[PDB]
Ligand binder design. Structure first.
Ligand code: HEM
Ligand SMILES: [N]
Ligand SMILES: [Xe]
Length: 184
């Protein structure tokens, strides 16, 4: 179960965040820590496509090779806070699992600049019990977390030392599929 009402960044710049480009997860923190593996690869694209607010997601477990993509349509709750319904797709956007009620995530941008961001999600997926997930993002898949985003982690009353890095997993990403999936 989730327990946090994450606070959106004051002055969040939606057009900059949702610019159609790719964000990589470099570090994450799951408050129900055994809900997710200790080794993982994740990235997203975020943008407006034909007037609709979208995300394209990519998950990869580098040990099991479990892979999945999703396309999300986001509804606005308040600036920097969204509710997203998702459909699982192949990398070309063909639907594998349709949008369903009960399958959604909240998405809150707690901090962002041009290069880095801190987000919170609460995933809901059928009768699974999932928790609060925080993720440090960067535009550069190899960027170490800088002071701006680490300070934001502190300002959320979290400890960056507890976040798990994705950097030693040899993660490789298909940016082209993420960008094209925004349209799907
Ligand atoms: C960048 C923010 C993230 C978002 C918005 C997000 C969103 C989602 C969504 C929508 C699903 C369901 C996909 C489907 O069934 O079609 C999912 C599943 C999952 N995510 Fe994430 N995710 C994020 C980051 C992460 C990270 C960093 C991890 C670290 C391990 C992770 C681990 C998982 C796992 C293990 C599942 C499978 C859940 C299950 O079926 O039991 N996710 N995520
Ligand atoms: N997730
Ligand atoms: Xe993701």
């Amino acid at each position: 179960a989730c327990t946090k009402n994450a606070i959106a960044q004051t002055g969040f710049n939606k057009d900059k965040y949702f610019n159609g480009d790719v964000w990589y997860v470099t570090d994450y923190l799951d408050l129900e820590p055994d809900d997710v593996p200790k080794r993982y690869c994740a990235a997203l694209a975020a943008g407006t496509a034909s007037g609709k607010l979208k995300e394209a997601l990519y998950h990869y477990d580098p040990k099991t090779q479990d892979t999945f993509y999703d396309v999300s349509e986001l509804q606005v709750e308040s600036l920097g806070k969204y509710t997203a319904n998702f459909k699982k797709v192949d990398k070309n956007g063909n639907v594998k699992v349709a949008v369903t009620a009960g399958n959604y995530y909240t998405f809150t941008v707690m901090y962002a600049d041009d290069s880095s961001a801190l987000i919170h999600t609460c995933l809901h997926k059928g009768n699974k019990d999932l928790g609060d997930l925080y993720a440090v993002l960067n535009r550069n898949k190899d960027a170490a977390a800088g002071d701006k985003v680490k300070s934001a982690v502190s300002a959320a009353t979290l400890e960056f030392s507890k976040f798990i890095s994705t950097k030693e997993n040899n993660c490789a990403y298909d940016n082209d599929s993420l960008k094209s999936l925004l349209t799907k």
